[PDB]
Amino acid sequence: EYPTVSEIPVGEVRLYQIADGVWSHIATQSFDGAVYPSNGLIVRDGDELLLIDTAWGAKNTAALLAEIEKQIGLPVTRAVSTHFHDDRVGGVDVLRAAGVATYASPSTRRLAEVEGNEIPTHSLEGLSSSGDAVRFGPVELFYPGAAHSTDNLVVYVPSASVLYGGCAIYELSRTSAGNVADADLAEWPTSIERIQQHYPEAQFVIPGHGLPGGLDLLKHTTNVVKAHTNR
Ligand SMILES: O=C(N[C@@H](c1ccccc1O)P(=O)(O)O)c1scc2c1CCCC2
Ligand SMILES: [Mg+2]
Ligand SMILES: [Zn+2]
Ligand SMILES: [Zn+2]
User: MF terms per GO, please (predicted)?
Assistant: First the structure.
């Protein structure tokens, strides 16, 4: 049902409808001779769409916009990037050229600039302290604390009970840590517990990469992070 790497030729994007007015977008990138999938989210708001995260690169993100137009046919008016790495902001210049207003926390914008990555235009206030949440159109944005990165956000869609964890939440099939170069391993389990406490009613949990599941992805991620901590 949910698409996997082998179904998606590089440069193509698939959409997967999770619930009424909520999709994930799935793309792939090649790095170091392997192929990686990546997810983001699309949430309908009235007659417009909110996009969560790029499709990891300019060409993928242009394909994402073309697929949205072909399959959904509503304008993407705003986009949020959930942390500063290229799988989240790579493609922001494509979004901007297409007239999408791009957003990230000020912490994410700063880190993206230091990294030489693309920088979303607008700064999301009210997300600087662990446990902070703000409404943004049809979603709640939540800063759980440092985890995969110090700036990582998660996104909850209340009407659909969909929680998008981004790269702070791992799919079940991943049993070792990813790239954790910018992670706060010490705080990651506490940040995951904040997500659990704030969204205990979540019915669908979307990781940054790979297959959706339920809230079980949170404790799975904590297990992987603690095992890596003790490596
Ligand atoms: O987008 C990035 N990495 C994502 C990623 C996706 C699939 C497989 C591996 C992987 O690292 P992720 O770690 O954000 O999930 C990039 S690009 C340049 C860097 C990074 C991460 C930190 C070091 C410098
Ligand atoms: Mg941000
Ligand atoms: Zn990352
Ligand atoms: Zn990632």
Answer: beta-lactamase activity; metal ion binding
Q: Is any atom of ligand 1 closer than 6 Å to the C-beta of 114? A: no
> 130 in the Ramachandran plot: left (φ > 0), alpha (ψ -120 to 50) or beta?
beta
In 38-117, alpha helices (H): 58-71, 86-89, 92-97, 106-115
Measure the CA–CA gap between 2 and 193, rounded to whole angstroms. Answer: 27
Could you tell me which of 51, 53, 14, 12 has the C-alpha nearest to residue 30?
A: 12
Question: What is the CA(86)–ligand 1 centre distance, in A?
Answer: 7
In contact, 67 and 14? CB cutoff 8 Å: yes
Q: Which of 178, 16, 151 is nearest to 85 (CA)?
A: 151
* Active-site hit among 25, 87, 117, 151: 87
Sequence letter at residue 43: V
What distance in Å separates the CA atoms of residue 144 and residue 127, rounded to the nearest whole number?
9
Closest CA to 217 of 179, 169, 180, 177: 169
24 has which bridge partners? 16, 41
Q: Where are the domains of the chain?
A: 1-231
Distance 167 CA to ligand 4 centre (A): 5
Instruction: Map tokens 């999709």 to a residue.
Output: 23
Maximum separation of any 2 CA atoms in the chain, in Å: 49
| Method underlying the structure | X-ray
